[PDB]
Amino acid sequence: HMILLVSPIDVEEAKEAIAGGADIIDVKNPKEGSLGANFPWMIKAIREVTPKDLLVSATVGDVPYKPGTISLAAVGAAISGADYIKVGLYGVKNYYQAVELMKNVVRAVKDIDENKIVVAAGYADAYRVGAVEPLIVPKIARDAGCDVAMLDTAIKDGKTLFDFQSKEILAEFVDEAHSYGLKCALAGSIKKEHIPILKEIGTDIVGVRGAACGRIDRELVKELKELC
Amino acid sequence: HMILLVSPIDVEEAKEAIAGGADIIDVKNPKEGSLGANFPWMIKAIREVTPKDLLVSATVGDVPYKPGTISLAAVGAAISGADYIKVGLYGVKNYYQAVELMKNVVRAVKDIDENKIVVAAGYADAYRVGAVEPLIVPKIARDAGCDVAMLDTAIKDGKTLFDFQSKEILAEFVDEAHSYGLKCALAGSIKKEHIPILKEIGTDIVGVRGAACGRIDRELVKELKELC
Amino acid sequence: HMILLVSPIDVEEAKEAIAGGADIIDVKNPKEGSLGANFPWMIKAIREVTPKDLLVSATVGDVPYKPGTISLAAVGAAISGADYIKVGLYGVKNYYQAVELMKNVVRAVKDIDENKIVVAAGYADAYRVGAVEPLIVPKIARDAGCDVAMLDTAIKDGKTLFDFQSKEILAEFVDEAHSYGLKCALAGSIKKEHIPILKEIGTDIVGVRGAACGRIDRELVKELKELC
Amino acid sequence: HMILLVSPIDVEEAKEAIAGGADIIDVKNPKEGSLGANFPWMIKAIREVTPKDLLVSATVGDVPYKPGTISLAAVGAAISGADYIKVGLYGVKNYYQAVELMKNVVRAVKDIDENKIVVAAGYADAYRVGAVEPLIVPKIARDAGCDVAMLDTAIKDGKTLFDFQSKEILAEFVDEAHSYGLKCALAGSIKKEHIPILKEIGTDIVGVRGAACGRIDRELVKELKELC
Amino acid sequence: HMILLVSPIDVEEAKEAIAGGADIIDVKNPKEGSLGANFPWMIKAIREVTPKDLLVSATVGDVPYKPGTISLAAVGAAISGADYIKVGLYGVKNYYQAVELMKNVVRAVKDIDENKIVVAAGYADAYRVGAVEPLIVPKIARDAGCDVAMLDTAIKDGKTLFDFQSKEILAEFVDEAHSYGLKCALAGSIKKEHIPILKEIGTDIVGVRGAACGRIDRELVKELKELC
Amino acid sequence: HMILLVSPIDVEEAKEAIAGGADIIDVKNPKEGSLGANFPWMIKAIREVTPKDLLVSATVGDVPYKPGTISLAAVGAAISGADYIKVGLYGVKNYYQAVELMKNVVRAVKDIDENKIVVAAGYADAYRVGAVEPLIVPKIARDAGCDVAMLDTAIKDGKTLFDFQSKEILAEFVDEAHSYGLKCALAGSIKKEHIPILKEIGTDIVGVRGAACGRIDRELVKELKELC
């Protein structure tokens, strides 16, 4: 079974995603990057509109290597109502820098609530932005004590997760994350056609917006949910 | 009268700064830059050790132009016990970018408590790092609804605030901040010799570490406090 | 009352600008940048064709921080017949560099004739080119002993002065320049629609080319002059 | 016979260079680069102190590719009293850019006085600064209608002309300049030991300062003059 | 008499070039740059399909300044069947770096076969890519002991050899190469119209592809051969 | 059992390494980078002096992403007598670029001699130079059909393999390479103290120079060999 994560642009789109059967309502800000951070008031508004039985995810940004700043930002997201706190490993260049930043984020979030989930997200197209190698995100997540290893695309030019990573390499990524006791989330201009492929490789969470649109349509969210 | 702000490296140095008569205990992390952010657990530990009649300040970083990330970081610092939240205007390039970021930080902080103080900090040596022009900091603080306009040095190579800014320009900066109803904080490898000059021009807050030292000595803090 | 400055590409366009009622005939070279310098023979030819009761302006370039070179260039422009000598503050990064360069240009020009006018020009979109903050241009002009504080756009991609600066900030810029005894010139793909706004805020000089057009039409210059 | 060119730092050093037997008194500003431009008032003061029978040289800078600005700067230097106007081919990247800039400088100077001399100067160590290839300076000078082809060093780290160019390549440079009817000037931390080598290859002008120093000593200038 | 060099994209295009009367069959890989290196198996396949009375040329790349790597690559090209080993002087910045790299390539090739020919190729548009000045290529080839001095274009945007170099400068380049006992090859989006000009100046080898197309046609190669 | 690889600077150092018990004699050129390529004549001289029962290794460089150039260079190294052909994965940015380049090198080498060994070498400190993530080298080597997965240091500032990679991460690297049927070589300012650690984790080959010195001493090589 695959969990459906939807990233609405506003409170109205969140209601649509909820009505359609989305499992996680993700709060991000595309103007600030792939995993750009939205504001504390927006995360709070989204947690307020989201039913109790569903989880809210929020990004802290396509982050530079600033452990202190990002640890404080993760506190801001958690306090604001995020159940999943997601870090875009953008400015971190290698395994060690990424583990150092993520360890501090993990401590910061768990200190707010031990039940909150930390997501280490790498970019499938990291080479286009100089970000940390995506294939080492499962080890970064394992060694930092994260709960979820994720991939998304950094540049939103229409090129998908599958244009940057082969099915075999992605299947290896998922297997490796699972071997470390982690869940695996995959996104990057995902289309309905990609859903059975992601389900097949054992992906735990799929992230979408475009596939549900143009604005989010509950009928299309329902269609995606059925495919999961 | 000038308020003395001291930036201790640890809880032990904070106790030393408190014992010596420091008015504000500033929590920063030099490893992450001039106004590098420390961790939520450190801000909390410092507020716990600091007497209730003294204020705690915390930096959110030498920030990139990421309003959402920085607004969340400001929440993290405020929740952790910071009374003053300081933003290093590093990655912001002009007046508009700086106002947009600071307006969002002001909302994030004032939403928690209208009594918490927001400091917009520019770099006296901004040109060495590509940061926003320091002389427009008072207008950025005015237009973003900040409480304090501050200058510090970006590069810690021993060059002081006075090596980058003339007494006349600094006196103009202080007068302009006061004309907009703001307080003015000045720092940048400040030495004991600089204190009467800063007092003379009407500076509200002086920031130090090196002058109180290599470790923070309460006797040296006392000496600086007497000069204020 | 607003003075109309027109920047013709050749002697024929200058005649058109003169016939249409332009007050200042500005000699620049767009091939070398926003305020690119034209040649001594062109400034001389333009002053020869321009009636004695009108003033000739000439740019010395989108200048790097080379006080000696620019002071010599200001001499070249003045000797060639320029009444206004305009410096594009491009390569100067801060207040101090800009004041040092402009003080030397002011000496070079005032030594020739105290009646010749020195214009310190900043870019409304300075952040796109790394140039000195435009909002400190009035203080640079005050402290260097310039006569006019000006703004123009650095990149000629069709984005105007009003796309980079708000009416309120521009009104503050004009008021500040006037408070220091300076005149204020504003340009940056100015359109006919912008003229009443610029007049309203107390702008002394408006610079155009595109609005008077693709070639300078005397009828269009007349229309702009009537609006001033 | 080799002509001795000396670059004094002030009017007092110029008097010393004159007394020692220097043939050309060169006015440059090392703070602005290898061939950094001094101010119009300094060139004028040097021409005023220099006897009628000696020539004054002045640089217009380590120039960017800005023909208009540099043509105006050459006018400033010529008007100020420079007999030789020297252009440092720094920001020009190839033959065509260098010829375009130099042709305009040549027109500008000759329009002031047909008897004035234009010097195209390349850097022996151009690769260290990205400047135009020094070995093509004789063709640039020929094709732009310059009078002198020159080489100097861009970075003043103590590395000489001979550390960057072999005697054979320099002899070829001199022969080529002579074949085009040009004079050849050579400089670049020249020492007394280098003088017979430069004379041997047929160099017309040698540029010094250090070899005459520490301040210029007329006795050492006399010694260098005897070696020429 | 001018020799016709054609650069086919595959074995089939090579056969067309051969049938049409091409004298040299050049093996390059546009994906890796202007003079990008193809693979050993491709050079071998081309040498096999080419009649023994015709020569095969192969590039080793738009090379960085890595003498050892490039000397080994030249061995690879020679062993693979290349008669002409062409080096694109891309990453070399000046005369000395280019002579050092080329001397090592010459030794590497000569140690395989004394009869194999070494081409030192510069870019007519070197300024666009930061490559060594094209006008010094004849001296680099002379001093490194190369057999051929060549120019091509670095960027394949449709701008030709004649857009970057004047006929006079090219005639000087050819004369200089001949004076050093070298052959001269010229290429850079050459069109049929350029052929009589190149023949007139004494060019030994002309390089084409586009002028023979769209795929290479033997009829078009025949037409170009007649013009040679 | 660990194999001892020694990188001598000359033929005399190679003899010392051989006499001391070195198993692989590695030919590199530090002037061109960490894994800078030496010349064909040097590889040939080393293969000649080395007893036939020992293997010779040679680097093709800290390579840019130029498959054709590098494939030709690998042919040059193989033809010259290298048994191991080592590629420094420097300019390749990700898994895909590295696999593409390495697959071509593997084909080029195999076409010369099936018994020759291809080493895919990554940098333990890749982040300092922008090179491909070292932790994905075992997958690159597996997928390109290489025989050996190696790590070395890019910058020779005295910082070792152990300063950049933890013993656990290195043990994982070795286990992963072995799981894909590869051998693992580790180097990077290795000291005698590091040898038991490398042996413990199952490293197949250890690379040294400094630990055997100052020039290579057979007594010191013998000591290192005993530790292996």
Curated annotation (Swiss-Prot), chains A, B, C, D, E, F:
**What does its pH dependence look like?**
Optimum pH is 7.0.
Source organism's superkingdom?
Archaea
> Does the UniProt entry include the keyword rRNA-binding?
no
Listed pathway(s): Cofactor biosynthesis; methanofuran biosynthesis
Which GO molecular function annotations are given, in alphabetical order? carbon-carbon lyase activity
Biological processes annotated in GO: methanofuran biosynthetic process
**Keywords, sorted A to Z:** Lyase, Schiff base
| EC number(s) reported in the record | 4.2.3.153
* Reactions catalysed, as given in the entry: 2 D-glyceraldehyde 3-phosphate = 4-(hydroxymethyl)-2-furancarboxaldehyde phosphate + phosphate + 2 H2O
Q: Which residues form the active site?
A: 28 (schiff-base intermediate with substrate), 86 (proton acceptor)
Consequence of mutating residue 86 to R? Lack of activity
To which protein family does this belong?
Belongs to the MfnB family.
Q: How does it assemble?
A: Homohexamer. Trimer of dimers.
Summary of the function given for this chain in its UniProt record? Catalyzes the formation of 4-(hydroxymethyl)-2-furancarboxaldehyde phosphate (4-HFC-P) from two molecules of glyceraldehyde-3-P (GA-3-P).
Q: What is this protein called?
A: (5-formylfuran-3-yl)methyl phosphate synthase
Record organism: Methanocaldococcus jannaschii (strain ATCC 43067 / DSM 2661 / JAL-1 / JCM 10045 / NBRC 100440) (Methanococcus jannaschii)
Q: What is the lineage of its organism?
A: Archaea, Methanobacteriati, Methanobacteriota, Methanomada group, Methanococci
Gene behind the chain: mfnB
